[PDB]
Amino acid sequence: EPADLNDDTLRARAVAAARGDQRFDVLITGGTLVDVVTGELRPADIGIVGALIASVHEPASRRDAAQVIDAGGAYVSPGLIDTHMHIESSMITPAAYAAAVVARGVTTIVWDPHEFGNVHGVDGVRWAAKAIENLPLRAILLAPSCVPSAPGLERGGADFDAAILADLLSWPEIGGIAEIMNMRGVIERDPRMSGIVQAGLAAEKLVCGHARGLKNADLNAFMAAGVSSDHELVSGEDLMAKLRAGLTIELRGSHDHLLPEFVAALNTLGHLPQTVTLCTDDVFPDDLLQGGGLDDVVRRLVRYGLKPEWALRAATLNAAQRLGRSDLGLIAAGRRADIVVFEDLNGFSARHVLASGRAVAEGGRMLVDIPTCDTTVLKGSMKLPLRMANDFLVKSQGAKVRLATIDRPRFTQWGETEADVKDGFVVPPEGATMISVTHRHGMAEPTTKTGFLTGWGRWNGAFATTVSHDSHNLTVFGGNAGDMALAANAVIGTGGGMAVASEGKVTAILPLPLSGLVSDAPLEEVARAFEDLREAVGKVVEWQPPYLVFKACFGATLACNIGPHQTDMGIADVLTGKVMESPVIEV
Amino acid sequence: AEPADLNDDTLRARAVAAARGDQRFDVLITGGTLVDVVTGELRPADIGIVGALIASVHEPASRRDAAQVIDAGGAYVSPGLIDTHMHIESSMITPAAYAAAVVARGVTTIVWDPHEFGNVHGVDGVRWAAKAIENLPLRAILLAPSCVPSAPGLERGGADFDAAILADLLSWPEIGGIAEIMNMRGVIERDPRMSGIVQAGLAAEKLVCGHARGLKNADLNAFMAAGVSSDHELVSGEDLMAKLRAGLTIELRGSHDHLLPEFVAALNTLGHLPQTVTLCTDDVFPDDLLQGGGLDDVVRRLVRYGLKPEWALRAATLNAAQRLGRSDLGLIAAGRRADIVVFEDLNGFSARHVLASGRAVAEGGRMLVDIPTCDTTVLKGSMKLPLRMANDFLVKSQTIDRPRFTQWGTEADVKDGFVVPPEGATMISVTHRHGMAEPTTKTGFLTGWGRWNGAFATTVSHDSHNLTVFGGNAGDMALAANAVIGTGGGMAVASEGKVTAILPLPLSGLVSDAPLEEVARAFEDLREAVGKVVEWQPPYLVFKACFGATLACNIGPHQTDMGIADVLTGKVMESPVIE
Numbered sequence A: 001e002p003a004d005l006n007d008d009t010l011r012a013r014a015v016a017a018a019r020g021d022q023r024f025d026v027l028i029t030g031g032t033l034v035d036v037v038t039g040e041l042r043p044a045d046i047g048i049v050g051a052l053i054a055s056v057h058e059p060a061s062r063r064d065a066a067q068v069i070d071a072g073g074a075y076v077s078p079g080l081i082d083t084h085m086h087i088e089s090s091m092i093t094p095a096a097y098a099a100a101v102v103a104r105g106v107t108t109i110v111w112d113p114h115e116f117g118n119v120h121g122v123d124g125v126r127w128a129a130k131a132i133e134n135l136p137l138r139a140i141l142l143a144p145s146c147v148p149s150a151p152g153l154e155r156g157g158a159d160f161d162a163a164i165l166a167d168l169l170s171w172p173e174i175g176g177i178a179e180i181m182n183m184r185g186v187i188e189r190d191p192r193m194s195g196i197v198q199a200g201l202a203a204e205k206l207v208c209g210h211a212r213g214l215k216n217a218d219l220n221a222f223m224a225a226g227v228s229s230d231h232e233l234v235s236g237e238d239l240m241a242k243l244r245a246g247l248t249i250e251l252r253g254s255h256d257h258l259l260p261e262f263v264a265a266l267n268t269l270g271h272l273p274q275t276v277t278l279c280t281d282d283v284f285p286d287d288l289l290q291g292g293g294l295d296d297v298v299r300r301l302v303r304y305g306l307k308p309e310w311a312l313r314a315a316t317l318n319a320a321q322r323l324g325r326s327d328l329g330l331i332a333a334g335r336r337a338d339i340v341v342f343e344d345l346n347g348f349s350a351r352h353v354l355a356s357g358r359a360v361a362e363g364g365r366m367l368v369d370i371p372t373c374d375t376t377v378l379k380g381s382m383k384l385p386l387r388m389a390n391d392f393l394v395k396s397q398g399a400k401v402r403l404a405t406i407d408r409p410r411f412t413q414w415g416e417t418e419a420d421v422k423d424g425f426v427v428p429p430e431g432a433t434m435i436s437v438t439h440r441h442g443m444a445e446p447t448t449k450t451g452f453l454t455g456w457g458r459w460n461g462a463f464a465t466t467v468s469h470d471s472h473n474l475t476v477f478g479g480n481a482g483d484m485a486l487a488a489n490a491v492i493g494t495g496g497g498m499a500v501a502s503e504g505k506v507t508a509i510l511p512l513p514l515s516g517l518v519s520d521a522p523l524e525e526v527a528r529a530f531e532d533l534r535e536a537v538g539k540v541v542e543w544q545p546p547y548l549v550f551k552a553c554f555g556a557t558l559a560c561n562i563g564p565h566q567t568d569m570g571i572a573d574v575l576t577g578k579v580m581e582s583p584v585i586e587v
Numbered sequence B: 001a002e003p004a005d006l007n008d009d010t011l012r013a014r015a016v017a018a019a020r021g022d023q024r025f026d027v028l029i030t031g032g033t034l035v036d037v038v039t040g041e042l043r044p045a046d047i048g049i050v051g052a053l054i055a056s057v058h059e060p061a062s063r064r065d066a067a068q069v070i071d072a073g074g075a076y077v078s079p080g081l082i083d084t085h086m087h088i089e090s091s092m093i094t095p096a097a098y099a100a101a102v103v104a105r106g107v108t109t110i111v112w113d114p115h116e117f118g119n120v121h122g123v124d125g126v127r128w129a130a131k132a133i134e135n136l137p138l139r140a141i142l143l144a145p146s147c148v149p150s151a152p153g154l155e156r157g158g159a160d161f162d163a164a165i166l167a168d169l170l171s172w173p174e175i176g177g178i179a180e181i182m183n184m185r186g187v188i189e190r191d192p193r194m195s196g197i198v199q200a201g202l203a204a205e206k207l208v209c210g211h212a213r214g215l216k217n218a219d220l221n222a223f224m225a226a227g228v229s230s231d232h233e234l235v236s237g238e239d240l241m242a243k244l245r246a247g248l249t250i251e252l253r254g255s256h257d258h259l260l261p262e263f264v265a266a267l268n269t270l271g272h273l274p275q276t277v278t279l280c281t282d283d284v285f286p287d288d289l290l291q292g293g294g295l296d297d298v299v300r301r302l303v304r305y306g307l308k309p310e311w312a313l314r315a316a317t318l319n320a321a322q323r324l325g326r327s328d329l330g331l332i333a334a335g336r337r338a339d340i341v342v343f344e345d346l347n348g349f350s351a352r353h354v355l356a357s358g359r360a361v362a363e364g365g366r367m368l369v370d371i372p373t374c375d376t377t378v379l380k381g382s383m384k385l386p387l388r389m390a391n392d393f394l395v396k397s398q399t400i401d402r403p404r405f406t407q408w409g410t411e412a413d414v415k416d417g418f419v420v421p422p423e424g425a426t427m428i429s430v431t432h433r434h435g436m437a438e439p440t441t442k443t444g445f446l447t448g449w450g451r452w453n454g455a456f457a458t459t460v461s462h463d464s465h466n467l468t469v470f471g472g473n474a475g476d477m478a479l480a481a482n483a484v485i486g487t488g489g490g491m492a493v494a495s496e497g498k499v500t501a502i503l504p505l506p507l508s509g510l511v512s513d514a515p516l517e518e519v520a521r522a523f524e525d526l527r528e529a530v531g532k533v534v535e536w537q538p539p540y541l542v543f544k545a546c547f548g549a550t551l552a553c554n555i556g557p558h559q560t561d562m563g564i565a566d567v568l569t570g571k572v573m574e575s576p577v578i579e
């Protein structure tokens, strides 16, 4: 592609159909064109010959067509682009995901498959390659950039040097490098991080950022490196500083509450800058089921009072530019017929969807089949014997010890406390929740590694998960060793996933046999089970928003974060670069 | 090697260092107000450069590091301007003269369709184009001349370009795509020879640019479905609007000064600048290059007529960079090429400084580095014919009406054994002069073309640049003809048995080798002079039209080196005798 549109036979026929001296293969009639170059709603009808949009012309001026799509009462849009996301977050294979989003108007995704990548390495990245080849969603894959995210602090299932990075960049399917989360590394000119960004440049493909926190000088350096986009917006002032820095913006929906901030900042700007794109980043199964993908970000922005002309412009043309794909994002002769028709510009119901000029969904439902793909190699990814009662205790030596702690959810910091020993096992200090983490990939000794958190409330039980950014080792939270094994073991033995245990009963399981991150069941099932498991864990611990909510359980072993974090190796602080092998400071 | 030149580990590491604040910049620009072409804001910032790279865009005055510190106080800072469609050749100077003229106004990239040399010397003339832009301070991104000549077998240039030639040109790293495709009716129809030329465009994975004068609706659609995506030929605001809506990239031209008011109004009217509007010169006569002139001057005029400078600037920079595929251009951000111009204000657009990759190359209005020249030898003696005589300007015997939009016509007599010309009407003479045909003066007959007391002859005639002479009587015509033939190309006015002005154009018959002063004086002075032979009665009837009467790729009937010639007949009439 776009080679596929350059075919002299189709071209020729397309011109001739455009000229009148032939019949289109499709006509879309009586819609209201959302003109994303001009911001007008304006009546017009579209003729498509094969994959090419052959004609954009006066409404009713034509009727010759091997088929006729009805659009009166409705809006005509380019299909939507999602410039950054992860199929893995929603806990379904890519096939599932494309039935859910194509159905809604999204014809192109740009997927960093770094979760599969950490779990299986190149092998996981080849899988996505395979998974999406015959799908009606175009997926441009970005090369996972930081696997693992902090070498020497943690051990996932993979490891990528520059050379592996040049390698993935040679694939035709790969479109650039994924969000570099080792920001400091890129800033102080780390040789691993630099070499990966050199390679991103030798290859003239996109180099894609994460810029959470960066201000002023630091940002300029990240850019100077070559990194050219961000999704980590924290505020309206945040969106302006990064726009004015000339970064391509990936406005993402995962935080619903910064949406109105961004809409205010854009509206006080007066126009929408052409460097704004839409993305979904990560969307749990539930959300995908009730809200949507990229369609929802359009939706909610219009609901927070962004004009639809802008939300869509950003979801389409803007997104095409960014990707150098000048076949997409816009309804015009000579471009691709990735067209979505919208009941209206409040709800964005999908009445019809095209991909490459074929009808793919009508009224919320697919009309074509989605190739499934052998999920085999994604299985068997727990490579550790069932966990025991004692795996969760810190065996130590005195009768009184001084423990290092992981004080504060999200914003982490060293703290300590005295605490009491008895039987070659620290007793958990009070006010303190264990985080036990255990190398599950077989790349490494199955040693359970236990730290003491604080700021996390009182644990009536436990919650285990092998989704844990970015190394997705087997990660357990609890306020008792026992409820910690009921919970871990329920996940090991289904092949990965999540469980809650309370008071000697497991109250909840969402198995994730593929990678320990996704599952094969339909999405209806997956959302149900994830809705349910949120309930269980709600009954284990009282959340105190924000910061001490449930999304933080997936996030605490994300070693590239400033702060101590428990990892399968010890307590990693990426500032010191060392790993606290044992939580006991002394005696 | 661009933009790989920006990608070098040794340079990147240093630029990051600078930005981080461990190493001094190679240049600071400080005290300016940055025109942020993303946000549309005017905003104070100071900028640091290492090498060719803008490394740091930061809070004013926070960094004094440096080395050389360019001053921008009381002044605005902007990325280099960029000309998404033009012709060095209509200016009548050497690429190095032109780069002198626009580099010193803040134009750091033009995109040149050199079809003009293209039709005079084929591959060789494109070949030259490239040998010459090679070391200039100006980046030129060459486009392949899509149509030499422009109605094949309707006329004759000095070359003939088929799909296999195009396709060759499109491999040259110096080439960015197919220049202005103006044989339109033959694209809309799938004529094989355009079609093969478009198709190589697409195979090439490079721009494909159009000339869409006139197409509307279906014809438009179909031009766009062959995959042509840009155009400059707009004839009103509604032509603006409609091509906008069709999804063309727009090459907003300054060369038709009289319509800028109309664009400015629709764009204001619409209410935002769309990201497909870009800006261009297209054809700038030498006196306008000097008085005005330059892509700068399209910015400057648009603003004078009421577009916001921000819009004007976004178009001239970040939009054209998107069009071009160039994320190293068009924007002042850390990570792009330090092509920057500091303008005194956003009225006069007065370049206090101009930086080109790393490097300051002009300061107030004058160049600060030498622009290397190029040998012109390939361009000599493209004049290949015998002196004419009044013979040539007469028709033997046993008819075009109207100017810029054309037509058909009638009566008169034969004295001797030659017609004696009608009345209300000037005679047109066109002679192949590139030596591929008999150099035989084909003679027609305009109307709604003043009275001519004398004649004008020119070897700059679009698009075959044959020897073209319009006049009241043989003799003057011959004396204009031989004046230009003599100089080896050029332009000249004749009256009453005398030559009143000559502009010599020894290279190709298109361009002098003299300084742009002379050439532009020689050229006002050429204007004065013709303006004493006839009464330019506008709208349309203007001097400029004397270069336009041959351009056979457009609707209506213009005379050419084989006679009088429709492209909506497909045919060419050899004499206009109907007895």
Ligand SMILES: [Fe+3]
Binding pocket: A179, A181, A210, A231, A232
């Ligand atoms: Fe991120």
Ligand SMILES: [Fe+3]
Binding pocket: A084, A085, A086, A179, A281, A282
């Ligand atoms: Fe992400």
Ligand SMILES: [Fe+3]
Binding pocket: A114, A115, A469, A470
């Ligand atoms: Fe992740």
Ligand SMILES: [Fe+3]
Binding pocket: B085, B086, B087, B113, B180, B282, B283
């Ligand atoms: Fe032109």
Ligand SMILES: [Fe+3]
Binding pocket: B116, B462, B463
């Ligand atoms: Fe020309």
